[PDB]
Amino acid sequence: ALPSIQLPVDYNNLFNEITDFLVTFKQDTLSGPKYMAMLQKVANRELNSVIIDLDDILQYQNEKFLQGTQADDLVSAIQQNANHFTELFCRAIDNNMPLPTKEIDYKDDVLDVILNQRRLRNEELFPPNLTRRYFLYFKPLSQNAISSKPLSVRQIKGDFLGQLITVRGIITRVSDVKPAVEVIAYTCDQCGYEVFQEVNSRTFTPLSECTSEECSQNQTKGQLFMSTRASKFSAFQECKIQELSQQVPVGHIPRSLNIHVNGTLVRSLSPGDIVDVTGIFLPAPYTGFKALKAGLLTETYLEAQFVRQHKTSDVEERVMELITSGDVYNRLAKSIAPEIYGNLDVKKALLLLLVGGVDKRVGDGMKIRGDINVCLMGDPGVAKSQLLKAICKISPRGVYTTGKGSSGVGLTAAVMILEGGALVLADNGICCIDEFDKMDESDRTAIHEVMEQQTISINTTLNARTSILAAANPLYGRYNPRLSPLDNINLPAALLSRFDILFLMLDIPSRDDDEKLAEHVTYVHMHNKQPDFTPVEPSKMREYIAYAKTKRPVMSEAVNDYVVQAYIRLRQDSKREMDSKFSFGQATPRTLLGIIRLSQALAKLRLADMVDIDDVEEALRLVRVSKESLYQE
Amino acid sequence: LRIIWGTNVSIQECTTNFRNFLMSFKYKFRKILDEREEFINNTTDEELYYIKQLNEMRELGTSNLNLDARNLLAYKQTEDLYHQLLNYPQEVISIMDQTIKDCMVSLIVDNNLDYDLDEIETKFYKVRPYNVGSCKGMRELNPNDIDKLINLKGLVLRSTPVIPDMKVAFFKCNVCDHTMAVEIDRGVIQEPARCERIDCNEPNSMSLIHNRCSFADKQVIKLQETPDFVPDGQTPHSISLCVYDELVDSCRAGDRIEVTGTFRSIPIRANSRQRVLKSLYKTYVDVVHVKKVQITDQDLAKIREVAAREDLYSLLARSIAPSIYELEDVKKGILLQLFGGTNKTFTKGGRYRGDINILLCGDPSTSKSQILQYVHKITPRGVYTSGKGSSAVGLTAYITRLVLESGALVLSDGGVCCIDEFDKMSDSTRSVLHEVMEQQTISIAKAGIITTLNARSSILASANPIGSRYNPNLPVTENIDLPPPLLSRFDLVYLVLDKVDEKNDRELAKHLTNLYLEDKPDVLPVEFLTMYISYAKEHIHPIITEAAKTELVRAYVGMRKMTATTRQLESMIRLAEAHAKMKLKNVVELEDVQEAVRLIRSAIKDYATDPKTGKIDMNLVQT
DNA sequence: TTTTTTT
């Protein structure tokens, strides 16, 4: 029934090699042993988990090859049976565990106090897993291959079971954290002795009968009582990773795959971001009754080892490099959509929105949003959609949306228990709306509920803090000078006031402009790079945006007085400019607020500790250019 | 000695530390731990706080004794015992209960006041520690925190019905008619293998009888995580709080409650019949103490002095939103609504309702919803809603299967209701609100479940003008865009419009710039004004008098000359009773009715409103 | 149960 098959691997010698590697391996190339230092941290309880790097094992095997000693191929044997090798790794960690350099606070650890007492009363008494307070993990092998190469859900195969492997795909959902009894401790009063049971299955049958030798000697039939303070418990969480849309074949739906995340690895993931997680693919045993029907067919799962989501001194150095390159605001603006030619003012406004303004909350309770919102109004074929998609790609958490593609309620929060909508997915990001003119005013009301106050009201509520961007075509598909600017915008004055700035661009034939645009476009076609200033990398651009946001500049007396004078001037200019052809909308105290946020964003981009009158004038100039683009005609 | 298991600390030592806290621990120790020696009083400090508390429990006749972890920390040995409690809250709580009972017996003997030691023994003293730790949400709670004392604040999503608890099993032998009672420990009954009576000589003859079995009161209350504790991106996780005996039903659902307790984790059976239990353990918090989140004599004296001041009406208006500018009339109407009119019930004509509902319309940047959030903060019970987020069914009642659930307006009942984007609010929701406001109560009929829920809520509404900015040419009622039935239902209608002048712009810009100029920037304190409204309702019950009746009849006839709804006259009477509460006048007066009519005239800018069609000139608004 | 949407 059990035909033994000798295989070209010996677990004893492999574990001896693992224990040797734990003590010998050190980050000398990066520079006691590094693994020994991690073990000492775990002994101090400063480290609650262990992660064994497959690249470290490969480097140790290469060192053994240089020494001439034959490598046990530990890195490859991990790919062979990582689940089996993990127990040997834990045993080697127990063997090579240093004494705690720092006190473990054993008195606070009721389990430790009771463990000393139980050993004294007893004088593998308790499970080694119960003795261990750390969780093993495996770092994916460095590229130089199943673990190193990420896989899709459909790409994964049943042969990959028992093997460490990395996967790529959208996280469909994450199960709520639940306790997991790694070891259940049973206690019986009749014996006075504790009996431990180690649970390694999805479900367990309680002992329900005292196994204590004291109860056996007394002949009493004791009723075991589980103790939460004595039984080991570990957080258990599940994740559903679904295949990336590119990985999905045409005409096929991506498949979500359940993943088991336990211990310190629990709660690490968020559904919004794509994750590249290396984990030992393993079968999921069926229950008894369901397995009787399933037969040889078996369920499967993945136990994550190393989790990585796509999206300091180095960041500070990069920001300093951008500052040394200089003119950072205009440089980032030109870096936005380098393939697109022109629209530098729109790019600068987009960069200001990306940096955002300072969010202010008064002591009395008033809260003024610091997030900036922008709108783009342009004739067809002016790269409105292209610029919006480029901005969405620039935003790590931003979401691109279309007015016809998604309902306003669905974008704010799509009803199926509530689930986050496109705006919630745009939390700490920028929600982009393509063809915003086509979007219905009914959904625009839902957008207006959130633009003025970040929170969403439905009951269920979410903070929904984000920056709003909109791209709209002018009424009848193109701008009409006979139509007023407000008529061509075709938007509510509430929307205009909630928006910090709206940009109007017109398509006017021009020989030199056509020649320059054709030159840039032909250069882009013949060579993917734009002809010409070098755009900053998107990672450094996002880092600079975060560094600007960290500044949080405050207004000064001179800047505030100048902004008040500008507010009076704008109100008077609206009172005199009731002519619809020249009227862009009445002056707004809230708009001066939006102006305050834009000045704060400019001072953030300049990294000024306080807002500057130059920043306020630059924001006013952005609005002035928004009007002057139409004035030029 | 007797020691709690795994603690290496004597249970007798814990009881002795609790006894040293109960007696031979001065209130001066707690006052010194609080410091603030100028605030502390030497005589009460010299008196023993816990001795006085045990004597107060004896005077009350109740075994339960409220406990302060701060006072436990104040006494030194009791602080050591409180740390031992933080390690083992349930065991130390039982020890402190026994210590409170023993100290009560000793205190009865010492005071020589009449009492029964047998009555103290029959009583089971309760220790209810509080301030053991900072309040935390259920999502913040952890399995390591399980079986450790903690203080938690949470808003009750709902309170479950009282659950019977098997305090003691009772065994009655069917074979031999034997009667027995078996105490229930750890929630498990004990059954002898053989008959309790040797003469019966029947194995397993004893049979449990549920009615004979003793039952202790028990209850659970669902508790949402506190709004600050909840993540900004997701709704709070909720954990029900176990409660029993006096702690059961301590706080009603829908009101914030702070319950100190020890977190508990219990195995969950894989099947109810099967002995197997899932490795995951369901988590719940058993509350050692239950607490919320009435005017003190000094607060009532302060409220009386304020009400004596003639400036106090405008002072409370400004105090509602001290930082806000230029909406003092709307705030005064809101303060009158918070005071509320008096309610009268009669066999004929139904019951006139004193609660006042206020509708406010303001052009964008009116700070109307800033003032509305200020009113929500000022209200003892606050309900805030957005018109886009408001739903009629959610406002009236919901059904879960099939039992009716409280509506948003019903939850607002017992407090002021705040509505933002009221112009954006659906006209169908306003139609649902019309009947509820006219009746001051909600009646719901539906398939399967038909029931009425109380909706006696003062209602404040912040509304956009129908035009994006308020138009003087537009009628004020049309700009508010409220349906006429709902406008009649509302006791007050408020109209606010921005007025532009160079000096006024200088003033407004100076206010905003001053708040900005501070790095962090007559008004009663908001809590003191909430207490003043509560004291006004408690000690002032205004009723229509002869002078107020002359004013009311004159106002009704004059408004009919100007058409007057009979509900508006009742609303004016409610606002007059509200004004008497604002003035702390026991009965409505002609000045109160005159102020109520003046408040309504000022609220809607009726004095500003042009005589024809109800439109208001913009210059007339803001005088 | 509650959207969603096709009949």
Measured CA to CA, the distance from residue B323 to residue A318 in angstroms comes to: 43
Protein residue at shortest CA distance from C1' of C2: A416
What residues of chain A, 455 to 484, have a C-beta less than 8 Å from chain B?
456-463, 465
Cα diameter, chain A? 105
Give the one of A236, A366, A446 whose C-beta lies nearest to B370's C-beta: A366
Distances (CA, A) of A247 to A250, B64, B430, B519: 9, 65, 50, 52
CA angle A618, A621, A626 (to 5 degrees): 135
Tokens of A366: 């008033």
Give the one of B143, B322, B513 whose C-beta lies nearest to A364's C-beta: B322
Resolution (A): 7.4
- Closest by CA to A78, choosing from A308, A305, A309, A307, is A305
Annotate A417-434 with b (16+ C-beta within 10 A) or e (fewer): ebebbbbbbbbbbbbbbb
Q: What are phi and psi of B292, to 5 degrees?
A: -75, 160
Q: Does A123 contact chain B (CB < 8 Å)?
A: no
- Determined by cryo-EM
Neighbour order of strands in the sheet with A430-434: A399-402, A430-434, A467-472, A374-378, A501-505
SS3 call for B295: coil
- Closest by CA to A400, choosing from A468, A327, A461, A480, is A468
State which CATH number among 2.60.40.1180, 3.40.50.300, 3.40.50.2020, 3.40.640.10 fits the domain covering A312-626: 3.40.50.300
Measured CA to CA, the distance from residue B583 to residue B109 in angstroms comes to: 51
Per the CB < 8 A criterion, the answer to whether A377 and A472 are in contact is yes
Per the CB < 8 A criterion, the answer to whether B83 and B17 are in contact is no
* Terminal alpha carbon distance of chain A: 89
| Segments of A389-455 assigned E as strands | 399-402, 430-434
Q: Does A235 contact chain B (CB < 8 Å)?
A: yes
Using a 7 Å CB cutoff, list residues 401-430 of A near strand C: 407, 409-410, 414-415
For chain A, give the number of residues.
633
- Closest by CA to B328, choosing from B336, B337, B318, is B318
Per the CB < 8 A criterion, the answer to whether A470 and A499 are in contact is yes
Beta bridge partners of residue B140, listed in sequence order: none
Alpha helices in B123-248 (DSSP H): none
Burial class of residue A220 (count of CB atoms within 10 Å of its CB; 0-12, 13-18, 19+)? middle
- Cα dihedral B25, B31, B34, B36, rounded to 10, equals -160
**Sign, Cα dihedral of B551, B553, B554, B558:** positive
**Sign, Cα dihedral of A584, A585, A587, A588:** negative
Separation in Å, CA of B49 to nearest CA in chain A: 31
Q: What are phi and psi of A447, to 5 degrees?
A: -65, -35
Beta bridge partners of residue A401, listed in sequence order: A433
Measured CA to CA, the distance from residue B306 to residue B164 in angstroms comes to: 50
SS3 call for B287: strand
Tokens of B495: 């109209």
Measured CA to CA, the distance from residue B210 to residue A329 in angstroms comes to: 79
How many separate helices (H) and strands (E) can be counted in chain A?
23, 19
Determine how β-strand A461-462 pairs with β-strand A456-457.
antiparallel
Give the one of A204, A462, A561 whose C-beta lies nearest to B234's C-beta: A462
CA atoms within 13 A on the CB side of B589: 12
What residues of chain A, 544 to 563, have a C-beta less than 8 Å from chain B?
554-555, 557, 560-561
Per the CB < 8 A criterion, the answer to whether B306 and B315 are in contact is yes
Residue A162 contacts strand C, CB under 7 A = no
- Closest by CA to B355, choosing from B392, B409, B318, B310, is B409
Number of neighbours of residue B244 by Cβ within 10 angstroms = 18
SS3 call for B230: coil
Per the CB < 8 A criterion, the answer to whether B81 and B89 are in contact is no
Distances (CA, A) of B387 to A444, A621, B475: 14, 36, 21
Beta bridge partners of residue B172, listed in sequence order: B179
Size of interface A-B (CB pairs under 8 A): 145
- Closest by CA to B131, choosing from B325, B3, B291, is B291
Per the CB < 8 A criterion, the answer to whether A180 and A235 are in contact is yes
Tokens of A70: 């034959």
Per the CB < 8 A criterion, the answer to whether B363 and B423 are in contact is no
Among chain A residues, the shortest Cα distance to B7 is held by A110
**Sign, Cα dihedral of A204, A206, A211, A216:** negative
Number of neighbours of residue A376 by Cβ within 10 angstroms = 28
Give the one of A228, A463, A497 whose C-beta lies nearest to B232's C-beta: A463
Separation in Å, CA of B250 to nearest CA in chain A: 25
Q: What is the DSSP letter of B113?
A: -
Measured CA to CA, the distance from residue A567 to residue A575 in angstroms comes to: 12
Measured CA to CA, the distance from residue A269 to residue A255 in angstroms comes to: 18
Determine how β-strand B358-362 pairs with β-strand B458-463.
parallel
CA angle A290, A292, A298 (to 5 degrees): 65
Among chain B residues, the shortest Cα distance to A184 is held by B279
Burial class of residue B84 (count of CB atoms within 10 Å of its CB; 0-12, 13-18, 19+)? buried
Distances (CA, A) of A37 to A32, A34, A97, B176: 7, 5, 10, 72
Q: Which residues contact A623 (CB under 8 A, 6 or more apart)?
A: A501, A595
Tokens of A253: 């739906």
Determine how β-strand B64-66 pairs with β-strand B126-128.
parallel
Measured CA to CA, the distance from residue B90 to residue A110 in angstroms comes to: 15
Long-range contacts of A550-553 (CB under 8 A, 24+ apart): A551/A603, A551/A604, A551/A607, A551/A608, A551/A609, A552/A358, A552/A600, A552/A604, A553/A358, A553/A600, A553/A603, A553/A604, A553/A608, A553/A609, A553/A610, A553/A611, A553/A612, A553/A615
Give me the DSSP letters along A289-314: HHHHHHTT--EEEEEEEE--B---HH
* Contacting residues of B for A554, CB less than 8 Å apart: 516, 519
- Which nt sits closest to A415, CA to C1'? C3
DSSP H or E stretch at residue A516: helix A511-526
Measured CA to CA, the distance from residue A93 to residue A103 in angstroms comes to: 19
